[model samples]
Target chain A: IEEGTFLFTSESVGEGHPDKICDQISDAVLDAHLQQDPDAKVACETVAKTGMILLAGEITSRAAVDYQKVVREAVKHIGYDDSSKGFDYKTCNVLVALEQQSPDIAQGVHLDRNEEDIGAGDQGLMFGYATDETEECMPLTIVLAHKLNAKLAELRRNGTLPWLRPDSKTQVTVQYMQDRGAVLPIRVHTIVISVQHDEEVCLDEMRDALKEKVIKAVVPAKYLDEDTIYHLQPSGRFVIGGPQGDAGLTGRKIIVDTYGGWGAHGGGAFSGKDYTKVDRSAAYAARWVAKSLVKGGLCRRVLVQVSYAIGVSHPLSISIFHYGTSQKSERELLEIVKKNFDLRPGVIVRDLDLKKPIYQRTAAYGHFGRDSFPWEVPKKLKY
Target chain B: IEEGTFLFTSESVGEGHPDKICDQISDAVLDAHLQQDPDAKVACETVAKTGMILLAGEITSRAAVDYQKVVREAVKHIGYDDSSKGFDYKTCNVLVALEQQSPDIAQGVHLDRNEEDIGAGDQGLMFGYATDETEECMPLTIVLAHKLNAKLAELRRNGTLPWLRPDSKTQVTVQYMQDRGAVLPIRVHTIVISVQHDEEVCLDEMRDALKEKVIKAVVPAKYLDEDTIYHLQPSGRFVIGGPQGDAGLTGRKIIVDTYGGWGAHGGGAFSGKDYTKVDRSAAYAARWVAKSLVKGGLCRRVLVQVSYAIGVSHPLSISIFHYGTSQKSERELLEIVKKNFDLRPGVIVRDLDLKKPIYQRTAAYGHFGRDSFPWEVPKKLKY
Candidate 1:
């Protein structure tokens, strides 16, 4: 075995986290517009803090949506309906200041006469990744972190933990042992969970309950050992949480939204934008490509990157990294990807069937690992 | 040559761009507070839209700076003072909703008993990177992109291009050729520049002027050739630009702020955060470590990652990747970094001198490339 040990950590936040709340609201607005018009061009952003939620961005759609109503509904659904919980959906201010898509930008993306060649709405880069360490093809640490976060949310929503609140975060560190020639080898090392709760709950009681109901229930037994460190509510108490404690704008949790820092991010945010935006669509396409390659046995782990320019119908560049785990040469893999994937913004929208009310579901937990997303579906590759 | 060819693209936005405007405002507020109270705990976020700017987040300090004045000054200095430009710094509504740091989080980070053991404000990961392809040890594509953006701003401010507005974006694609044994080899591929200009400026005239004053003047001559494609104002007219064209929020350009998609992001945002937050301080520390390693001749390119748990004084993990260019093994490099660097939150703050008001300058262009930042300075690494 090679002589090296390393640790990698990734984190996730629950739906009630301020940033996630904004993400959910932005995506909810997008979903409402998509429900009315499949070709809606929307770029909505949300900011939530204290007692207000500000919604802004561009929209070019014929859909009818009460912006304030939609935002309140999204907040109410996220368990923020009561004022005692720091923020209240009914009482919070919902300010809408959205404008139509800039005619200048719209000119490049919307073809005047042809629908066949839809240019990318913006210029940017997006990344997608896949790994064999977890059943979802995500890194084990992130997968575990998400599971714990989801469990905490589930316990709160289902009334299993009456004292629990919506705001929470979970992080996991994995110690990786490199074999003599292995490319990626990782195992669990530590877990940390910080969940907001009611003031009545004592620290000792909360810690014991989390250990028994959340940590042990979610983490696998094989990954747990005497050396594993669990830091629950390291800050001691979190009664003052959610937007009241911190301000959150949409797209802030880009790392948690994707591969949890296990993979690269092109810095494009996905929650509020439509399919025409290369940032959102291309990222999904890249994930689909990487997952297809791994599921097809082309590699054990893969990272894919794609870049585009505004008003350009074709990708400026596409690159793939197999992390030294591929049997095929890098050139051969690139050729395979180029030949199989249709990366144009218009084609990606059609290929993924992205113009639907499927965005709001992706605004929380982790976006890529869920089995329901179309991009997560593995396809058999014809070689 | 065992080979492959790939393209890497990175983009930059001018200081007048919407998101950059918000970033500048957020950091400007941070700087104002830090200038007064060196130990201020600030976490400020700004959202700018049509005719309004909303400032939110937590701040705990005795600084008495006027928030509205600081924000207006930042916008005015960015050249959005003219009412005809769709946004006026003096007239736009400035709303502030800042609160004190949550006592729970404050308890974790502020160790009253031990002055030396200042805990991390939050739990997350941050990455830092350096490459030898450019003189600044940054990726060539991003460096060129920033140069073009800066040049556009210069020409606008200096009256060389009086018709040029404050909103613009530049993207560059670099062709990298990896030989059988090459570590890193890259050349310029294609460049795309979309700059906002006055409606009176004709397309041909704007293109010619930008080519002469911005593109041709900024991009290196060696990177330009007959084959190099230049898409100037790819979106045609950008008359409706700045905050009026698109809504903007702080921390939206984390990728552009750091390694421009060339390196991994821990997903922690830098803008509006104080030194006690690992998200800001550790990221700077990571960059310092990577730059030092590269300058010390330990490697040609390097990426460093560190993760922290809330209330923990030390990093949970620190990993380094030399990208096959280091003469020393990964284990040796890791040991050297651990022994040389002080990653504890309090130590990092003192070591890097992070309490000053130097962050506003880092909000625009790129945060990691400029030599003025303390983190950009390299130190000798004794083996």
Candidate 2:
């Protein structure tokens, strides 16, 4: 239902957050395998706690990479090299429990003579969404929240906030307003930032510095007003954070990775999965289709949902929602989507160039809103 | 957006599925802890592989339950007690790595004096949905899919299909039709079922028996038509299943656990999480509110979304979507929700009586459609 004057919120986490760390490690493993063997079939899952990192899941690749080394390097890159930070890259126990892909599943996804008929890696659903609310064709709340989180990490990494640690989170609430009989528009309502920091930085200093440099610097001035609420490190004390602060698991932050609750999800996770897994590849295809629709002026906002059977080459269903903002009828839009897009698993992988080793960067922050990703690129709508 | 003729699919897994097993274990541990200590704080995660179950995450409880015992018992209850089934409940390794709940987070959730101000355990968002398509106010596809999954499990456990193993999945695709300018009605489009079984039953026998007993019994005759498609054991063979066939971690099946991709999800997972965590409590609350609205005849279908920051007693935002089927305006619905619901974390736990050890059954099948849960009870509207 189209609503008038409602508040919506979305959240994002920084690179060093426990769940993000596991995601980073899993994606790093996926990237390494993809780099060595583009046809690799990987579904890696990582779990991190106080003093250990456990890697599990299936991998069918010709890559000869050191599992421990990949995990350690990923953790080190996330700035978790010291034991004082809770988890140590050098000493944390790294346990690898990987196995080959299940033959039962492989038989369906592997095509003998026709790559065009390559079936989906698994049976599942994936959703993609696009909106003209922001320049990126992404939801405003998620985009702003991602920006604040990235700015927090950037400030920490660039030493602008030397006391700031990598573990952090940002949440934004937008109060959407509807002019009595006009279109619904939205503005920022509340901004919340919880950052892990060095104990040396007092709460007052942290709040003042973060508000000026992170929040104000990232959020547009128009969205902020005297009534806009801001909560910076609501829990006052910090220092203990990262995987040490709490346990993290791969795929735990699925909402933050996609549209931040602004759109529907098939509940499929992205990181650690290779192109063959429809969970990752099909999701990208759906986003590409939605982005193309929005860019083609078919709709101001759109959500595309696609589902597949494990061994089926074609999707079982492709549904679209334009939120009553489309110029065309739903049937007409469906016809356009079917005529223009090839949602078969192999076609999605090849078209998106998803066999590359670019998953590491997507492990953190928002995956759908970024500009550099191929799926974000606008494509011409045929007929 | 409201659309006329579209196909929607949702999937469900049997209790013996690898991911479902992990969910069951995590919830069992949570239940045991709560049974002993109602004030316990748990964020347990379970990972299951071939021969081991790794238990990770944090817990702060006075319970002295044996982690290994709890895991093994849960596995046994899932009918994986035999070594021939790829996993042995008695022999599989159980590694415990639970830590105390982080003091930083506990500080926000723990109420020292005013329990009314008890804040959320973490920062995240959660969603709830209801529809008139089913008797339970759940989506038709998800309700039917879960029924098939449960029926598969029931046949296996009841000796009606003794050859049936624990691991299985079911998917339902509903082809919704809008008669020219009339309301949208749906019919069964496709039904897919896959179950792990003993090699004793031949492919022909397995298909014939399952189609006759399982599919025919569960699906309504009115929904099925000559055009409806069925795929039984599409993989042809599934003897190698369960934890040995694939790795599973708790919370991986979020969509199957909730609305089955019918509605939006905040990405916060249930299972093993204590009520203080908004991920579990708020999600239940949202479902209750949506169910109340629909049962109270305020709407034919509804979706409720709520968001919170870590250690905040009040939700940062609350929104609803009635999908053009509601008689009331969005503003009117929002006011009704606010007036009748108590969304505070502590209030939700008390109202739902969430401290009891009743979560194990909720780990496998869909959580929303079940009749026994307190959230499913229709609440009075203040008008």
Candidate 3:
């Protein structure tokens, strides 16, 4: 953001968006494996198109999973069970090509021998961010965008929007005034939404209807000015949506799943991979630590980055950025964080109790800031 | 980065890293399509496992290219041809599952009567970053990590590292000193490298060999400190590596392909999608404009963000961050940026010449900061 006034934007995808559909399926499969075996080594990837649901990736599990059933259940849950909508959960070709994970990669991880010594599945970086701008400790732009998306699906499910289909995306542009290094929200600048729907409703009528039922119900009126612009379905006709409109792949919506383009990303996707990867577990851990800082009033905004190497028991390094908004010096904050957070892959998996089947809920609607996730629960910092 | 001093880290992967393998295959397929049709609407994705390459995604082009051949060639180029080494490009099963792109998405872009009004293919955010720390205007940690990875592939291709396999990753950590709002690099804090090898070479010999043949060959001597830590092959044996060790997916290495965990990401992958998607073209244009800022000495470091709406002609918002390093006010910088760069989806595609079959080269290493790409070329400022 500029040091005076600027527009900041973030976007989100509904449960029916092509990528989210794949993410949900991947996480659902992961949940199935984890439910059967706590130590199931699963890295599931899903690809969806008009008429097919392709399941692939490495899985080492003792579970006798009905993957065909799992795929259909996931698709139906996202309201993609109708052939009239281009994809039918019951009829979509479900190709299961999953195989055992590479023994060499497995060896490196299990070779650590001790729970504290379990190595990271891969070498990579993961990031976590938080802000005091919203009660959820997330940026306001992404918060509303995700809400708009979630509510769109909610409206469709509750028969509030009978014409609504399964594919949609929302974008929010918030005007912010920055003084020195701190930023304050001014007002909502613009909102752009694209929702799939039946051909019966006219574009104009649906636009205003969405504003009233979706936007008006979600966003606080004080932030929505008279000049707030709405570009609903900038695309002409979204009748062909879901995986039919675009091929969907797992882990494609990293930004929508994270800070919504606000903070830096280590480029790791959370949906398919197991917690031992650190790409998922350590990221949740970082968010926990960052939220802990803001929840304790230690900073107005914070970004925590943690790096690890494969088969390494400890994090290679931990870094913090306060953007000059810290109540204490950044070094002091680092010390405080180090004392409270154990970022090792094994420790993080345990700290968050990530071995359970809690991953399906994180596949969409932005993983952080939601109170339902364990990582969203902030810990008391060591002041 | 912190004011006064901090440690920052970035990572890079060799061309044979599982994700990079899929990325290369995806872009290779895309390049094949674009070669026959510059306006090819290719969004190809590849998933690689032990003995198979699954090719999928949407393509709207008149090209009749042999995708199977493309996959094998890409694999061979990455040096994954030997079966005894776990995977063979020739023997691997290839599954083709490509289909035409959703006409609904195609309709949105072409619906505009005017060439300048062609809308974005998707709604999303994209970011570009630059710094004065290196001649390439990239962060030192990421710069070194990429150089290390690139050289690793180079050595493998040239048979310089005869024992080396295709899969490898590199990490670089640099200590920095900050005073007030400015930061200066102190020394290289740590270097971690993992490389796949044959069974003959022992761990100790391979570690020192990589330090000399890869690390010492890439990193500048002055950056290294006497106490700089080297955790070579922190993981155990990686002989069973590449796609066999991990399930590869396109877009999973967005951070590696971009700023290596330094800048913000919009969560879109660059390998498979065409330039019509603002995610790739706008991101390139933003980098071009940001590099122009530092190239003209307008700022010591900068970040540019551009957001777009699906089927919308103009950018929804444009934001800038200078980290208090600009030669002028951030608003003034924003003006100069807007004046010089046309951020509309079509204009960005033209400005960056992104429609060519040049995407395959960008699949590996970092995309920004490389002089070979047109986006890395800095333009003159109006002021």
Candidate 4:
């Protein structure tokens, strides 16, 4: 397929998007719990709609948190402080139905474990992908989409784009062709930005400002040409947006939170889950390993697969895929992956220091390709 | 990468798994609305936890559905009618917080449009994939995983495994190698089954029965060999599961609902959305096109991506990817896709008959591989 040009698209949402609001609140709950107990067992789930926020999940922590306060603060920070914007953080009702973690799995998590060996708390498959396409080792399309979203938030908060409301979405499409047995993005074929607006701004005015302020400032110049099609609020006015416009569930933005549409997903969600759940930690660890390999030039791009069972300390399998761009045989890379990485839940949690109260910041923007996080740090690999 | 064997794993959950429970309830709401208004605008999201079910989303339908009754019936049919199994449909509280669909988007959907020029409801990216690995045109690992999960349900309902409870998970790890220029799964490396059981069943008693009665009977004998490892309830003893054990949210099991880690996902969920949503219909159409090519001797495997803008009648791009096994050039195949397919959302809905009350059954089990669904039926494509 890379022998000729084809279009690939990726999408992103703002921090005020309904799904991201739920994600931030869920992570806020997790962060509060982790602050009190590093070993907190948390699987926070949040749902937000027009007039209420619901928090319902399993939590085994001594943290006496004001769940309502958490929801209010998270929404307020995302700039939904006024009901005139369709939702007010302080006015919405907060409903809490939290419970203790089920003992059936709690017993299994600790049944036959010692200090060093801890089985995964669940059974699932997870994958992590890395590429040399950008400085962050993420696909260029998603990188551009995320930048466009963050730029909107940046301008809105600073009153640069005063008409820009909080709930905005950006999607980028790039044309790609072959280069040395791998695909390289050549140019931006299309971009669509849907930003919530104020009544003061007309349709043509908003489109022109965003075409220059958002698109031109964020995306690379080489990727955009005269043929690059721009779509600004193609759905027309978006004033009544945010949670009031659309209901959102935590973890619904997994694709936007990860590689966009570039790689495979194991279907497990990352936000709100603590390190004990293999769903979050294993996926992070897989990225840690894949980035270590690709950044060190053993492969130009790679995807690492790691699977686990509930009561098994060792991983079921660790597979590396670098189709046609590997410096070594894929099986040889497998040996390196097995030796260099410990796929156990306990080792992964400790190795990455994943129990910190640092997850709320990850709820928005793409989680990967961010160098501030431990998972994005490149490592010097051993033979 | 396919020169040597590497294990690929896929997972599936039973009808009573927490996320699947929410998925079923969400689809039930959608199905009821679609029954009354075929063009019903519905986006239903459900959240389930201990002793409570909360429904929240946007819907614009004249159908007056008993939302609580839909939740109850969906739960009861999943075999969770008794509280002794940790969740009871009859006794659990049901809370509803639904709103009318935002008129902002509705105005755009109907704005500046003719009968044949209905725009997409939202701006997002969607993809569909097909492979010749199995009779269902899906990857073999997920096929066996779903079959194993359904077999567990089959046994419990038919009284063959009466000790089994409803919440269960099955994961299959298959070792694959190259054949005819594409990867072919060779054997089952491991199988993990975590099924909730009644207290009357002992751990060893349940494991032995599941090995013979569940695994061997459901999976093809050719895939299992002497080294196929089995794990039955590897997490520990019987009892305590379902929504009480874990909170469930709709649209969380997307990877399980689709390709299960084999192909790229655009991350848009399938259940609870009506036909007008490009998230569901565009993905289904992409699969329809990819399936036709693979089944008609054009490619051994393919991934099709069709992207759109929210208020644009025509698609932004139509990309076909058959990395190495296409009989025709990828560009040539894409031309075929363009000429033979009408990618407008209205034409797609009409061609596939997508507005039926058939979504509730698709909530569980995988959504794509089933032959009874319109998208799964192979088509004789025209040049």
For TM-score, the strongest prediction is: 4
lDDT by residue (tens digit), candidate 3, B21-113: 999999999899888998888888888888888877789898889977999999988888888777898889998888888777888775544
Q: Which ten residues in a row have the lowest lDDT in candidate 1 chain A?
A: A178-187
Q: Is candidate 2 or candidate 4 better by DockQ?
A: 4
- TM, every model: 0.97, 0.97, 0.97, 0.98
Query: Over the stretch A1-383, how does candidate 1's per-residue lDDT look in tens digits?
Result: 13576778889999899999999999999999999999889999999999999889999999999998889999988898788899999999998889898888888778592554888888888898998776678887788888898999899989989899899999998877654323343557778889889989899999998999999899877778888888888888789889998899999999999998877898889989999888899999999999988888898888888888889888887888888778987778888988888899888877888887999999998789796588888766765
Instruction: Give the DockQ (2 decimals) of all models.
Output: 0.71, 0.60, 0.66, 0.75
In model 3, which regions exceed 4 Å deviation? A1-3, A179-182, B1-3, B179-182
Residue pairs with colliding backbones in model 3 are B4-B178, B4-B179, B5-B178
True contacts kept of each: 0.80, 0.65, 0.74, 0.88
DockQ of 1: 0.71
lDDT by residue for model 4 (B1-383), tens: 35566789999999999999989998999999989988788988888888988888889988888987888999999999887888888999998888888888888874556746788888888888888988778998999899888999999999989988889999999988876656788889999999988988888888898899989898878988898888888988648788888999999999999898987888888888887788888988888888888888898889988888888877898888886888788789988888888878888888888788999999888998895588888778888
TM-score of chain A of 1: 0.97
**C-alpha DockQ for predicted model 4:** 0.75
The TM-score between candidate 1 and the true structure equals 0.97
* Cα lDDT of model 1 by residue, B253-368, tens digit: 99989888887898878888899888889999999999898888898888888988899888877888787778888889988997788899888887888888999998998888
| Candidate 4 error regions (>4 Å) | A1-3, B111-115
lDDT of 2 by residue, A1-383 (tens): 24456777889998999999989999999999988999888989999888889999999899998998999999889887776666679998999999998887777568472676887777888898998777778878888888898898788889999988889889998876544212244568888999988868898999998889998899888878998888888766657888777888899899899998877888888999987788888998898899899889888788888888877888887888787778788788889999998999778877899888999989988788785699989889988
iRMS of every model, one decimal? 1.8, 2.6, 2.1, 1.8
